[PDB]
Every structure is written in structure tokens, then in C-alpha cells.
Design a protein around this ligand. Sequence first.
Ligand code: SF4
Ligand code: SF4
Ligand code: SF4
Lengths: 439, 439, 134, 134, 292, 292, 292
Amino acid sequence: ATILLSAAGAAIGGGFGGTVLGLGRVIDQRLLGSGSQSVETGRVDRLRLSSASEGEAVGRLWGRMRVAGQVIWATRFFESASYSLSLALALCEGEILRVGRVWADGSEIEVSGLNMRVYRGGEDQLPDPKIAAVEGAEAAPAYRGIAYVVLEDLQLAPFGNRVPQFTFEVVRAAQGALAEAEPDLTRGLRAVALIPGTGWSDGENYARGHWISGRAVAQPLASVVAEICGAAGITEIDVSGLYGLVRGYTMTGDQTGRAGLQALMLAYGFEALERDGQLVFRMRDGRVAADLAAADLALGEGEAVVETVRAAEAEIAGRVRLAYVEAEGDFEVKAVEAVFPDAAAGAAAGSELSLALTRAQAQGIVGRWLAEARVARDTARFALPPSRGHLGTGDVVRLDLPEGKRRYRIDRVEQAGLIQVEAVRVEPGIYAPADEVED
Amino acid sequence: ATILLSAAGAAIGGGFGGTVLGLGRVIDQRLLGSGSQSVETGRVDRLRLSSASEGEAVGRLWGRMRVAGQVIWATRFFESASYSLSLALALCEGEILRVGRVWADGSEIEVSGLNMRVYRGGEDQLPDPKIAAVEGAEAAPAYRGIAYVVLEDLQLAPFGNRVPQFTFEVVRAAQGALAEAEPDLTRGLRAVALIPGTGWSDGENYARGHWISGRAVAQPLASVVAEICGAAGITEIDVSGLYGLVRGYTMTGDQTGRAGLQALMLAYGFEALERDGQLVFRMRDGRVAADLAAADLALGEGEAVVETVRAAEAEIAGRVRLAYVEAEGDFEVKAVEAVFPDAAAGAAAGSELSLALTRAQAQGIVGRWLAEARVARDTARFALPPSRGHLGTGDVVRLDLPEGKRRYRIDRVEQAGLIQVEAVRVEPGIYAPADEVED
Amino acid sequence: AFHEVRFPANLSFGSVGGPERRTEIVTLSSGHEERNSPWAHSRRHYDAGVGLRSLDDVERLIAFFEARGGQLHGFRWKDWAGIVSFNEPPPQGARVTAGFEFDVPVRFDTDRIAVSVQSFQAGDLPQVPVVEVR
Amino acid sequence: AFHEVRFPANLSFGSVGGPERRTEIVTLSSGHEERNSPWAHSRRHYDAGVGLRSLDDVERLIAFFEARGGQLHGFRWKDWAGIVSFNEPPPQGARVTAGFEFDVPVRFDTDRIAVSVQSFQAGDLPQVPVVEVR
Amino acid sequence: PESLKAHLQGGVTTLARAWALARADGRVLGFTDHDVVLRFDGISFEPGSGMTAKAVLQGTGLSVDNTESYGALSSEAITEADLLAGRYDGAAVTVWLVNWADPAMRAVIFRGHLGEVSRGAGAFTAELRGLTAALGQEQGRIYHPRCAAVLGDGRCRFDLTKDGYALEAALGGVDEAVVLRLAEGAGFEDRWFEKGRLVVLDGAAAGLIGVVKNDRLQADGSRLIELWQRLGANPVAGDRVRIEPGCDKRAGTCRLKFDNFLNFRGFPHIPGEDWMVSYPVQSGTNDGGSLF
Amino acid sequence: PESLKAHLQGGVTTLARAWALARADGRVLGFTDHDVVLRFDGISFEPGSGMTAKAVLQGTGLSVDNTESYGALSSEAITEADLLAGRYDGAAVTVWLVNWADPAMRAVIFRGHLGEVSRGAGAFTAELRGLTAALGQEQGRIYHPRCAAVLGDGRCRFDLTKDGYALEAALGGVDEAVVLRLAEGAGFEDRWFEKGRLVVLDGAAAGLIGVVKNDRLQADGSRLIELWQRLGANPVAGDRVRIEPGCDKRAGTCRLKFDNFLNFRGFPHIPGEDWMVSYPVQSGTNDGGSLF
Amino acid sequence: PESLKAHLQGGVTTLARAWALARADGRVLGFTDHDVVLRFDGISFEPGSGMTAKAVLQGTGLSVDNTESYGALSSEAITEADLLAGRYDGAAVTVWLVNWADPAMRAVIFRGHLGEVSRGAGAFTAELRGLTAALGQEQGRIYHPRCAAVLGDGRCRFDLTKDGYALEAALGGVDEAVVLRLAEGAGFEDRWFEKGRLVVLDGAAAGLIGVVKNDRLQADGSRLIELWQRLGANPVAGDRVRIEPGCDKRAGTCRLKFDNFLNFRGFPHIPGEDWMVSYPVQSGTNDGGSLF
Ligand code: SF4
Ligand code: SF4
Ligand code: SF4
């Protein structure tokens, strides 16, 4: 007997379920290009609160960034007669540097007032804190990986009498097998000293000064993306072409692995190329590798030497926005925007990045996207012969035409013995410092 | 070499990504019909709270409706010795009428107790409030578009000592180039007076009384939909066929433009027709323009003169629901439902409209949808010749048959020189007042 | 576009060709029809030319496709079938002639041609369709 | 729609054509099935006309397609096969004649025609399918 | 159709499609199916290009209409060096359905906005987005601590010619259309205009807008200026540009460089989340001040 | 299959498909592939219609099964003036797989619910939704301040015939099947039944339910009543309708017009969100009362 | 390509595809298009199987690459009794593009991971997931009150051979490859290993891992052990298994049975949601204690 209109049903499931197996987002997709599908990424956490449940995941972070933590092993309320507790707040995993500048619900509490005992969460397996001798040694938990902070005889008097939501500035050095080789500051320094001293003051040259207070924490972008693939298990990871400072990224547990990495591909713009099995992560530039003439393209599928698509004017992202974290002061969600002067009439396209970066840098990034997303309107769809197959999937083609000589970075190489390319328009001058003043 | 089963992959992306480029929802789709895809719309805000972050968008509203506002420029807590602040809460954009009936966290505070200075947010660029001479004149912000309300020497004593969430009744007149032409009450009145006076009392004839207290605020539906396309930039907008009162609609910033408008297409039901480049917004009626006989249809694609689809009984929306705002009393989220007497056994389909309307009107709307969604089960799919091409995309066809003579409003006209139509069944008696009693 | 020559003189019996129209049509399924014409003119659309002479004629014919041809040039075409009107109806033809005296400038409807050898000196090619681009 | 002329007199042996019925049909896979037609007439649908005369007849025939033709005009058609009824059943034909005496106004079912030259004076064209639009 | 129904109800009809697009520049272009050049307005529709007219769709919903409109590119036509450089972006069309026998028998099918143009293989294919393209986009301000408007905007009117602010000087040394030497660098501050409009009003790039960055004068008032993006048309080292001054969109740069601090349209103070959930501790500074 | 395996394991088999649908009205309809009229139950399956039987699908998941079941509409059959008016909506089917040589050798493939029927070109195509159609729908009450039940419901039993409440009178003046004159208007209040069941039990619309609105008597007890929707079958100005009274589903209209205020099944007071986050101020009214 | 461009820029080229997959076991397999067995490394590529090489795709995005790689299964080859039992799961490939005239002229197209293998009709079809398969997965710990690590893990090192913990004994009585009799049951506690690794290192299932359950000794140290799942290859009642002990992943079972309570990597106390929103009532127990 014949078939019904579940011919449309078998066309979907699993007719299209096989695809995504083997495979605000308003601005996330244009920056990756045709590329691949941009996974939902980094709904930035504002009002960081600590939930004491059993279903919250272990967070991870790299550098100076506040994290909420959560309660593990709180004793009963103790009335001195006007209360007292013994908390232990677990921040993040891995060996960390020390936790300073604790502030609870509200503005600020002085850490000298507290009796906190910070712990690195060392794989060395730090023993029991002995404040858990309330429980006793025989049931004292001895957390190996996670970096918990206990609190001792905490007076609940100044903040009500309820438990306040504590939030902790944490400094975590990037770890992993690629990180222990090639040591950056956080252990590479091996004794700096030279404290300038010589005592409201002269901090106008701090952004250009030789001294390294504050910014010694920030990990290079090379090892943090190496930490992601290390935790995911890819040790074949190649990352020598990366040049960036992280300064406090933070993704939670069960953040897909790649969706934590994909926020970095919007900020620093790097390729995630994978020429060979190395998965080369190179920083994206305009350095042209191909120099094709128009005479040197192959015969494509659609029988056009170069199909050139220019995207709609009604969707060009006239103004772009961020949701970065303040990273110098009290870590709070902020926003800058870049507005193109001719067409400001609409198309607001913003996204949220959960990392922490300064004020002139955020206006630099959004100034870079608004230029790039209007440059990346043009896409090219051509086929080039396997006579020059050394055009890796992330290279950029000069592509001489009779009218233009416009560069093109390429995506979605599908070859089978005929390299067919979905390029995208990329200029070299996009990837520069914006050189803006600071706050 | 051959191709893989990414033939299913290239069938999706961007094989189907080109479509939505050039293009509770349970009841939203049936009311627009085959029509077009109903965008997610109006998750109604209950517990209106004010967040003092930097990532919340500028709200917009039209008429008497409470809005949360947010904090901009709060001074430090001042202890008289038992606290004091200097807030400024920014409500919405555009020139507004005055803000009355402020109520904070909780029930109600008397505005005579406050020292608030309301501001219209005039494009005339209102100067500094001089309460920001705390900051000084040289850094005093002088907000042009947004309508902020400062608060002066606010005692935080009655509501705890924390800052309470303030919520403000705001009256905003519909603006835009189509609104300044054809003035309605809010400036059209040009002096009414005639205060009845002649002093629990006789308000049983207020809904039928000649006096205009309260309902003088409510803007006509013609200019509010003109304000949307004006802010979106369509000045070619045609709206003379609209007849409705808005009474306090509210969409936030980044509400897509159209998704704010699409809530009105569910309430007042209007076409958004676009015969010509005017984009005619006409109110939907049953006024028949076509009078086709069965002999006068063209030869379609499927080689059937009229394909008639009747939708499933298991999905007819047996009971429909709303989430309107109270609009007379303390503005709170409410709900009414209309239940069809024969089939009440299931299919609850509700949606949420963020506008404000009275009690007999809400039961009128849900009484209209439950009738319409069961009428709009029948859809017709026929083709009519270009000999009568003056059937615009939103007209309604009599469509004489041998058995029935059932009307059909049309959608999805695709012509290319053969006008092929996906109609939908529409009766005239649906669009009437329900004539119900009030609360 | 050229004004170069008519053609080689030889044309075999069977050189077919007649005017075209788009005239898209709806065929109203329950009665008569209604149909539109956007042309006001007609592409003459000559087909099925055949060169048949010695091989001395072939090398001036294969490069007829090549030299002044390429793809995109005129080579005014001779019809064996300044404004000409047709008065045999009470309607009118009134169809213009950009070239003089039935010369109908065309172009070949081929990506390639195919000349055959039939004997020591026989040169044949089966078809060269044209459409008379303006 | 015109009333211009019948046609050139010549029609070759093989000028085929017979009534065409919508006959919308369901074809139940069980067995017997029902059907109905919305015409109450029948498009006569004549095909395969051939003009064969001298080349003097051709130029009044190629512009027959063009001048009063275009695509969308009548040119009443002569059948070699005011209301005519058919009484050989106890049912009836009762089919109308808008034109007089079997003249059946039509239109050609072609975007183009294709006239051939078969000898110094021979003019041929293989087919001109019509459908007698009302 | 508008009173051509007498023409149209007859089966004998002759309506040939035709349309005009108005570019962002003042010139229009003409296109028709009729195969003979015709005009009714002063547009002179040419059948040399354009015009396949494939299947205009409609919808009562806010979703746009569409027509891919296959055609040809040529020297008289769009020519694609014009198209690639940045023109035809917000090009407005009207499609018409004229009678070629009498062009006073016509109507508009839709007035479009021509969103996506895909050119290739010596031809172009241009999706005609419908009247409702602007709906479906996000418009709003997000209370961010910068400004929000451009210089010419109504929310911050400036009178951008009011003094020696604009740099009107003609161009030399165009190099790779990002670097621009500019013979008359001298006349202004170093790094005066960092976010400005490089409107170029002569030559190849006629009326084309780019954005400046790196306003640096190296020697004797050279004023080497970069841009974010290519202009897309090469200036010929003789063109005239004018550059409006640069706004950092910040309160300090607003009031110092420009006088217009009144028309700010920005949100400088905007306390923060941690202020909001804070309860007032009775320690340290609790007197009225800036909170900055 | 149920013990026809002895028939079925042989390659020589003869199982001809056949099914019966029971309409919402008491009559059933018969359909078979066998090409000869056969019956096993009192259904008399007719091969004159129905029966293409295309590809019943299955699933352990809650998703329904489906069968499009192409067929024919005729005067003996569905006839489509029956179908369009509102019948065959919740029509229940059983598909069978009978042996035509012996109809006692049969089973049920599924028992369906016939959701979507698409008729066209002189035929009908009717998607047979599976047994699990009711799952996948939202059922609930939302604490709204009206009532929630219909009059006949178990949550509000009424005894709807208990007095002169129902209007049993025969119909005249049907007009456009929305307006109904009704000769015997007199006997009740003006605007008595505003949300009632217009069950019409005779003639063309036999047992068809509409909902009333605008119960107005103009002169001498005319009682002109509108409806929300068309009945879909024209009443013939002689039919008998009965109209149950109208419930506004409100506490005031409940207890006044009807006695049954006990069986309310509604939520009248329901304080509100602003009450919930309110802290008690010690000013004004703070004594026990209605809060209304 | 790596310095075969001199070979490749000529139109006369001869690059024949070829690839090697390394299974989870130490053996590799060879595959080539060249139709003659060739090798460059010690792999001995065989053209007897594999190798249709359909359309490797790429992407700058984190999404994997793919190649379906149609081929043949045979006794020398994969043979599909190997594949079905649980091998070739995380099989790592490298595809090469060798010159068959000179195999020193080669490169790697990608190094894959061979995710989905669909075998059927006497052939196999194996989707080659790209290098980035591991990205796109969720990895994390959720503060649950058990442990979180396996026995061999770095977060809980154990020295799993340190005493008589492992049961090294050779197998008898395999039955349906879930029940295992085991001749040498005696030597351990009853129900000693309940979540352990049944690594079988001889015979048919060579190096195949299952998980134990129901460690019960019925008579004279029989130790009948179930498994969760089939091994997929039948052990032959003579194989040698070793079973590591079972960890309940709980603090009581941690410290009692095992000494390693220090390396816990778990979260035993974890107070709860109701503790968090609780305000301290000044009644009953409010002295410092376990809260357990
Ligand atoms: S700084 Fe002044 S002129 Fe410049 S954008 Fe801001 S408000 Fe407008
Ligand atoms: S008013 Fe009474 S009878 Fe009517 S629906 Fe409500 S509870 Fe039932
Ligand atoms: S009980 Fe001990 S050995 Fe076992 S998994 Fe837990 S920590 Fe590791």
C-alpha cells in the first residue's frame, strides 16, 4: 500500500536528526561566519547568589573573577546570647591562588574580621580542616579537587541574622599539561620583587607603567584554551599561535565544553582551524596565503566560477552590544555599544560574554564587531582545484577579480577531490587595537 | 568522489536558513491563521521589580500602565540619626504626561509624602534637576529622551531600611508623525472643563456616563500602531481603518518591533494587510469583496479547484485563556477564560497579552477567540485567475459552492501570474461586542 | 554584435524555424481561459542548418563559429522563407527590421558544433540553431 | 478573440483531434469508483495540422501565427470531421456552436512554430495543436 | 490593479511586468519584461537587464514578501563594481504591472526594499524583501554609561559646521584605501577625529561613508588617517573628502571637546546591582555624596 | 491478528482491509477494500467509498499513529455537506483486516480518532490520529475569578430541566442561521440565556450545538437571538431547538439566577501578587475584614 | 599536502587515497584506494576492504568533520563479530592521501575518531567524526553526596593490586555471558565486589570490560556473579578474568572497606535548600553540632 504524508515525518525524524549529531545569538553567528552553528553561550550571571542545593554544578574559572560558591557542611546555628556558624563555601576546582576581598550580601566585609581558612583544592589532597572535627575525623570529608573556603565562628549579626549570600574574588592559575610546560608569570616569574614604593596619587600612568600589580594574575590565552581541550581530553591540541590575556573567564559546569570556548572565539576572534589532526588554534589575521586569480578557480557545482552573496541591508547589525564584567573595580555587569554613524536606524545585535575585561577594551571589542559584521556581509562560494589543496580550511584567499581584488577567508571546505569553498569577506585592518582612552 | 549523509546536513544549513531570513503560542498561531509564523510575544511581567544594572533595556508604553523603572544616580545613604537617599528612577522614553500614584514595595505610599520631581523626558532637553548638584553642574547628566523621576531626601524608614522596589503609574501619550497630525483627546481636547460636581455614591452609570475621567488617557489604536512603524522607520504606514482604544500597552526594549505589535493583532484582530506599498492596517471584518462562484476559480497546482482542509478535533482549543492587566484598580495580572459547552473535555490554549484592559472586555476577547479558533478550523487552498487580481492579500471571498456558500478570508497569496491562495474560514458575526456585564 | 556576412550559401532542405512567444497562460479550470502576452514581437528562432560541401568549405565554416562568432556576435542570417507589415488579416504584423531585407541578426544556440566527415571530401554538420537576439 | 478567417485551405492527412474531458477521478483501490466532470461541454482539442503548399502560401501562414495570432486570438477553425444535438443515444449532445457551421474558434498550443523548407518551393510545418477556447 | 479591470477581465490581455529601483544615490534604474524600452514616469525602463520576476508571495502576517528577480549585470546596468562597493544596500523598488499598449493602465504589486542580492556567473539574483523588513529588528537603548546617538541625530543636535570642526580638504595619497595621507593635514588637533564620517563626495567613491580611526599627523601636518573598513571603491588621490569630528561618546569628551553636554542622551552614573541588594551598614561613609 | 495465523502463515492468503467509523451521531459508516459489500457486525461495509489504506505507522512513544485513508465522497457516503457542517469531528474508527472468505478471521490494527480530514477534487483525505491523541493536550484550571465548569458538568450539577428554565419552543425565522426569530419568544426574562446550548434536534441540523448571544425580545415576545458561529447546516424555519439557560460564570450571576452557588468550582477572592510581597504597614485599616 | 605540490601542480598526478584506523586494542587496520597493497609505515594497507572515501567536509567552527567511508567487512577485515561486541568504539583513524608511485609523498587530511558505524547488507558505513568530537559534551561534578571518581582515577588513587583485593581466578561456567560461575569463588567476602571491572584478558573476549553485580557465593565458594550487560563476545569457560573490587562510592563504604578515605572527591554533608532560606529560630537546638 502507498505511503502517507509522514513522508514529511520520516524526512525530519530521523531524516534530519542525523545532521546535528554530526554537527543573544543575533551577533554570534555572523562573527563565526557561515562557519558552523553557534551554540548558546554565556548568559552572563548578574546577582551572583549561592544556592545550597545538590544539583548545582562545579564551576570553573581562569583568573581574577568573583564566583558565588555554595554551602557544603554548615553546622547548626550557635547562640552566644547573636548567632554563629561554621560554613564551608566551595568555590571552584583545581589548585588556585589565594582568595582575597570577600564581600557578602551587600557592599563589603573585611577579611581580617573573618576567621576563614582558604584551601587550594590541591590534587596533593589537603587534609581535614580540623574545624570539621565538629563532625570528627572519622567522617571528615577531605575534599581533593574542589577549592573550598571554610568560615569559623561567623557572627551573623551585621547582616540580619539569616545567612547572607557570600561572593568571593578568586584567582585561579591555568592548569593542564600544556600549561605546566611554558610557564607564564603565575609560576614563570620565579621571584620579581622590585616593589617601587617611594610613597590622591599618580595612577595616570598605571596602564603604561612597568610594574605588574594586578595584571600579574591574568593568564595567557594560549593555556586557557589548552585547559579546555585538556579537560575535554584532546591532548593533541596545538596552540602556539595564540596571543591574548584572559583576565578572569568563567564558565560553569555542564557548559558543553565548546560553548565555554566559543565566547573566546568572539572576543579574540581566533580560528580554531584544524588543518591536520593537531587542531591548530591560530589567531585570526588578514595574512593572505593563496593569491588566486579569477582564471584559477575550478568548475563548481552550480557552474559559476564565483557565486558572491551580499547579505541584506535590513540585517547588518547597525549597533552591537556587550555584557562584559568590570574586571577592575567591584566586578559588575556592564555594557558598551558601538554605533555606526550612517545607519544607526536599527538592527541592534548584542551578545553577552561572561569574561572580565576593562573599559577601553570592551569598547575596542564592540568597535571591532561592528566593523567586522559589516565587512562579513559578503560571502563567496567558489570551487578551487586540488592542484592547490594546501589551502587549509581557515586560510584567506586574495582572489583577484576583474573588478575588485577583495580578500576572502574560507569556511566549510567540502572536497571529495574537488575543493569547494564557502568563503567570507575578511579585511586585514579589522584586527588592530582601537587605541581608545580608559576609565 | 561521492557525497555523504551531510546531504541532509546541507539540506538544513543553510538549506533552510534562507527561509526564516526571508520570513504561550498555542493560540497565537490559529488567530493569525495560516498567515505567518507568530513570533513569541508578551510574557506578561508579574512582580514588576526594578533592577539597577546596566543591561536592562529602555521600556516603552502607551497610556496608563505601571512600569518598574530603574535606578540611575543614587547618592550614598545619608544618616540623619533613620536613612536618606536621592534616587532617580527612569521610567520610559518620550514626552509623557505626569506620574501619579506611586507605590513602592508593598501596598501604597502617598505622593504628597514624597519630594519627587517628575520629568517629561522632553526632546526640548530639560535641564539638570539641581538635586544632581550633589554631582555638580559640570557632570550633571541632563537626560534628553528618557523620562526620569528623581526622589529627594527619601526616608528609608517605613520600608525596612533597604531600598524598596518602586513601581510607578505612568501616562504616556502616543507620539510620532502620524500622531501629531489628527490629534486625539490628549491634546485634541483643547480645554474640556464642565466638571459635573454636585456632590458610597452613584458610579453604576460610570461606564455609560458622559464624563471623561480616567478614560481620557487612553490613546486611539490608530496612532500607537503608527508609533511602532514610526520608531521602526516605516513612514509609509497607512492606518485610517483602525478603530480601537489602547489603554496602556507596554513592550520592553528589544521586543523585536513586530512582536510588540503582534499582541495587538490578537486583541483587536486587525489585518496588517499591505495591498500596496502603504502597508494598510485595516480592522478585520466580514465585509465580502470577492463573490466567486465555484465556476470562477483557476486551475491550481494540485489540480483541485478547491482543496478544503478541516483541522483536527483533538486540537480545537476547547477553552482559551488570557493574562491581561487589571487597568482599573491596582494594576495586577488577571485571567479570564471562555469554555465551549459541548467540548470542554480538553485542549486548553492560553496566551498572555501585556496590555491593560477592563474586566468585561477581557471576557469579551476570550469569548471572541474561542468562537474564532473554532471557526478558523476550515482552510481553503484554491487558485483564482489574474483576471481578477484586485483581490488583495487580506480580502475575504464569498466562494459559492454547490454545498455551503461559506466565506473565506485569504492568506499567503503567491501569484507569478496565477494567484494561488491559502484562505481560511471567517464569519462576520465573530467581530461584534459580546455585551457583557462589568466589574 | 557584428555586421559581418550572411552565411555560407549552402543550406540543406530542412532548415526549420519560426517565431516564438512566451504568452503565459492560466487555463481557468471550470471555463474558458485568459492569457497575457509581454512581447509585442517574436523571436524568429531558426534551427537545423546544415553545411554540405567539400572540405574546402569546412575550414571557412568551422572558424565561422570561431572567428567572428565566439558566442556573442551577430552574423546576420539569411531567410529562405525599414518595417514590414502583414496585411492578410485586418490586423497587422508591423514587425520591425533592424537589418535590411529579411536579414534577421541572430546567434548560434550551441556551446559546441559537431562537423562530420562523410567521405574523402564530404563535410557535414547536422544542426546550428539560432534565436535572433536583438 | 477574432472572427478573421477559417485557415489556409490545405490540411494534411493526419489532422487529429477529439473532445477532452476534465474527468476528475478518485480511483479507489478497493474496486469501483465514482467520478464527475465540471464542464458540461467538451474542449474539442484539434491537433496536428500541416500546411503544405508553395512558398507563396508560407508568408501568409507564418504571419497567420504572428499577425492576427500572437497567442491569444480566435481564428475560427475549420473541421473536416445555433445548437447541434446528437441523438444516436436516448441521451443528447446538445452542444452549443458560438460560431456558425462547425467553425469552432481555437488557439494554437505552441510558444513557437517551426516551418521547414523541403525544396525550392516546398513549405512544411509539422503540427499546430489547438484546444478551442471559448 | 487600479481600474484596468476592463482590460483585465477580457481574456485578451497584454500586461507586461516592469519595475524601477531607486538606489541610495539619487539615480534610479529601469527594468521591464516588455522587450521594448518604455516609460510612463521619467524612469526610461530598459529591458536590457533585470526582469525574470519569479513569484511574488504575500502574507497578512508581519513577515516580508519576497521576489528573487533574476537578471543581468552590464555597464549600463548595475555593473557589480557599483554593487560590491556598498551601493544598492537599502535600495527601494516599486514593481509595476504596466500595460505596454497603454502605460497609464498600471498598478504596484508591492514596494520593496531589496534585501539579499546574490550575484554570480555573469548574472545577479536579488531577493526583494517586503514592506515589513524593518519590523522584526531590535531597537532600543540599554542604559549604558556612554552616549547613545550619532552626531547628526535629533537626540543630539550639534550644528556640525558651526566652526572649524569639519576637515574639508581634498585627498592625496590614498594607498590601499584604508591609509589616506591627506595633503592638508594641518588645521586641527592631533587625534581630533577618531570616530567620524569620511564622506567622499567626488570621483569614484561618490557619496560613500567610512569611519575613521588613528588620526595621526606625522610631519608638517600630514594627518595619516586609517579607516575601519575599505571604502570598496578606490579614491583616485584627487577626490574631496570631508570628515566630521570624532565623538568618544563619553561625558568628559562630550563637554570638553564639544559644547553640547546638555543634549547628552546617555546614562553616566547608573549605580549597579550590588548597590541594589545592599542594605545600609552604619559604618564608614554614610553621608550624602557622589557615590563616585 | 488473533488466531488467523494458520491462515496467515500460508503464503496463500486473502486478507482484505475494511473499516468502520462511528460518527458523533449514532450512525456508523462502512468501508472495505474487498470490492464486494460484506459485513460481520451489523455495519454493512460498503466498498463504494473510502479505503486506500496508506501505511499505518506505530510507536512505543506517546505520539499518535496515523493513516491518511484516501477515499471518495458521495450521497450514500460522507457527502461533505455533512462533513463541513461540523460532523465527523470526534469520529471514532476501528480498522479491521478481515478475511473476506471468512469474516470471523479478523483483528483490529488500531482504534483511531480521525483528526484531520482534507477534502478536495471530489475526494477526501482523512488523517487517522492514533489512540493517544488526548495525551499531548493541556488540561487544568488556573484559579481565575470566574467559574470553571459547564452547566451539565459533574463539578456543577444543576438538573437543567428542573423548572421552566429551558426554552423548548420550535423555531421560525432562521434567516442567515445566526439570527433566529423564534415564534415563542415569550415565557422568560429579557437576556435570560446569554451563554447557552442551542441544541437543534430536528430537520437538517440534527443534534447540532451552537452558543447563543444577544437574547433580545423586540416586540410581543419575539426573542431574536444571535449566535457566535454558524450552525453549518441551515435550519428550515420549522425545526425544534431547545436552549439551556445562560451562565455568566460569576458569583453574583450564579447565586441570583441559579440556586446552585454551593457547587461553584471557582475562585472569587484570590488576593494578588501585590498582597504577597506586601509587608504590613501599621497605618490605616488593619482590622479583620473582607479585603474587598 | 606537505611538499608534494611539485607533484600536484602538474595535471599529471596520481594521488590514491588510503587510511589506517587504530582500534582500542593495539592492532591497526589498513585500507587503500590504490587496488594494490602498499605501505609506508608498518601498517600494510589492504585494498581488500574499506575505502569509498566520500566527501570529507570542514569548518572553522567547533563542529566535527565527517566522512562516511563505505567499505566491506570480511574475515581479514573488521568481520562485524568484532565490531558488534564492543570494539572499534573509540577507534582513532588518520586518513592519508599517498602517492602510490612514491609513498613518501603524503599528508593527513584529518585525524578522526569514527563515531557512528552503520553496517548492513554485507557492508559497513562508518561516519568519521572529526577531531573536535569531545568538545560539545558535558563534563562536570554536581556536588552530589556520593563519590565522583572511578578506582583507578587520579582523583582517587588506590594501588588496586596492593593486597588480596583483586580476584585473578580463571573462569568456568560462563552460561549466557551474564551469569559466570567461577571455579575459584572462595578467597573473599560475600558481596565483596559489586561495582567492579570484569576485565577478561584471554580467549574470545580479549581485554573486554564489563561491570559486575550480585556477587553471591552459593556453595563452597562458587561466587556466582551477574553483570549489567552482555560482554558481546562469549567467554569459553576457560578464560582468565580479573575483577577489581567494588566501590559503593559512599563515605561509610569508602573508609571501612578501603583505606583511602582521604582521597574522597565527594560531598557528604551538603546542607540543602531549606537550610539556605531558613532564618534562625531561637527555639530548641541551637548549639553547634553535626546538623546530622
Ligand atoms: S558626545 Fe555629545 S555630540 Fe557626541 S554623541 Fe555624545 S551627546 Fe552626541
Ligand atoms: S454559575 Fe453556577 S451553574 Fe453556572 S457555571 Fe458557574 S457554578 Fe456552574
Ligand atoms: S569509595 Fe574511595 S576508592 Fe571508591 S570511588 Fe569513592 S573515593 Fe574512590
